[PDB]
Amino acid sequence: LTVSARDAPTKISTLAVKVHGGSRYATKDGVAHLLNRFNFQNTNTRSALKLVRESELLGGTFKSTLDREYITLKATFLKDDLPYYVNALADVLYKTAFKPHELTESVLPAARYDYAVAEQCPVKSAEDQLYAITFRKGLGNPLLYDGVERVSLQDIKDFADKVYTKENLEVSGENVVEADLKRFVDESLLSTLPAGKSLVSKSEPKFFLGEENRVRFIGDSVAAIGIPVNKASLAQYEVLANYLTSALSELSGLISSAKLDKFTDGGLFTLFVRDQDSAVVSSNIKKIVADLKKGKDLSPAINYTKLKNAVQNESVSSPIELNFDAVKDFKLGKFNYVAVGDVSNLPYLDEL
Amino acid sequence: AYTSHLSSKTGLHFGRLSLRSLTAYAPNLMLWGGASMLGLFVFTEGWPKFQDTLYKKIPLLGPTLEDHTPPEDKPN
Incomplete structure (x- = not known):
């Protein structure tokens, strides 16, 4: 629960909750991708449609990005709407619904689109081959779900409450008053999250050198x-x-x-x-x-x-x-x- | 201060029809009722009852519709 902000005399605030939950920490192949595509679906108290159609009227958008280390939950909004968006991101982290109809209608077609758009670029193929032959089971995990090992819904729930813990996240705000952001991240649902372990390891990631891989394309x-x-x-x-x-x-x-x-x-x-x-x-x-x-x-x-x-x-x-x-x-x-x-x-x- | 919510309302609607579209569409279908009533005034112009009740009190197109055939050259 490291909360940090940085004020500015401007119009747009930008909140971000970054979680050490990337591909490097994925249990099965692509669970970080599927949790990332799951992120802003419906919660137990607010639908995914209600979130979009209230955030549009309050003037802001939500996004969530995946890379090797992080799952980043970004909220770009107009400056004086901050408690709505901290409660929105706290609800997304704490209580998301995890329905199988959401897995089969939204999240799996979105992930299938992500894989099919990254498959056509041979530089993304070469980059993940490079990562996989350098680091083998940590950072060399596949970045996107392609269904070679089947990820259930219980795998996504298990990864979600493994990585959505209070010690494994940072809260960082551009153009936010830091005192008010710290007052709004407690008195929220980021105080009720489990105080788990921080998944980042201060070791060295055990690289391998001289390796080679060739892919037809x-x-x-x-x-x-x-x-x-x-x-x-x-x-x-x-x-x-x-x-x-x-x-x-x-x-x-x-x-x-x-x-x-x-x-x-x-x-x-x-x-x-x-x-x-x-x-x-x-x-x-x-x-x-x-x-x-x-x-x-x-x-x-x-x-x-x-x-x-x-x-x-x-x-x-x-x-x-x-x-x-x-x-x-x-x-x-x-x-x-x-x-x-x-x-x-x-x-x-x-x-x- | 800081907005924490979004105080809203729904109003009145019954499916596809709202009241806001009824407010937006009210005067133009008043005009449509007038347009098709003028179309009826066209399409019943040869009708004698609508002639002698409505179309012959026009101040310049009144005496244009009647005969004044004398009651001398018609058998009935």
């Missing part, structure tokens, strides 16, 4: 490399991710994208090279690894990535507080590799 072909990063060398890889996509590097025309997903215990640096024909992807990924196996001086990109980190920490307010100044050089060591697409013409890990 019709369409664009992607070659992806992935490097697990500990807590110490996090900012060197952020400078590398911002250096490879900026105009400072000669490889920016060959790299489709490059990013570093950060966590509270390290992260994963992913790099994707994607187009429609395997000869260009093979040529480009061989050039990328042959240039990264020699050194790269990352010190030009420090102020650039200071700006980029300020930009991307304006949107989120998860501060990781990185150094950026002790970053001097990079040389590629060992890395996992995923080939998605025309894999009879994409190179293997031997040839990189």
Whole structure:
């Protein structure tokens, strides 16, 4: 029940209840996705239609987002309507109905749509293959439900009262008075929630290196490399991710994208090279690894990535507080590799 | 202060029909009643009873409808 807010002299408030309930904590495959798609269905005291048609008249919307670590319950609204929305999110966390007709009419078709829209992008396929071959049973869980292991409704209820506990959530409010938000989160149903355990582990997530996976796919072909990063060398890889996509590097025309997903215990640096024909992807990924196996001086990109980190920490307010100044050089060591697409013409890990 | 609820009402309705649509549709179907009454005034113009009761007291289209055939050149 860490409640934090940040005032502003503006018009739109934004509440968020973030729960450590992502794919990394999922018991079966896709239970976090199904609970996420379940989130704003009907409660025991208010229907899902009544919530939408009263929030429209009060001027605000609800959303809930899933990633590897979090289930985020966001409420964007007009500034002086705050107790309605804290009681709405408290009711969603405490008492949601969990009806099987809601599972079979809304939530399973919504999840089927989410899986079918993420299946067509070969970069999402390569990213989850990369996560799964780097981390095996923690962070390498599948992100979305695709029905390979059957998730019941009791599995969703069990995951819901496993992760919707008072020690496993944060409440964070943009443009909210912090004293009034703290007064409204108690005197609510976030005080009656079970004071469970916090699921985040301060260990290291037990990575694996040198792994490779190849997936058949019709369409664009992607070659992806992935490097697990500990807590110490996090900012060197952020400078590398911002250096490879900026105009400072000669490889920016060959790299489709490059990013570093950060966590509270390290992260994963992913790099994707994607187009429609395997000869260009093979040529480009061989050039990328042959240039990264020699050194790269990352010190030009420090102020650039200071700006980029300020930009991307304006949107989120998860501060990781990185150094950026002790970053001097990079040389590629060992890395996992995923080939998605025309894999009879994409190179293997031997040839990189 | 801070709004915690939404004080509302329902009003009156009986399915698809409200009273708000009745208020919005009342004067135009008064006009529709007038339009079809003028259509009846068209479609009963050759009728003699509606002529001698209604259509021959128009101040300029009154004497236009009658004969004044003399009672001399008709057999009945």
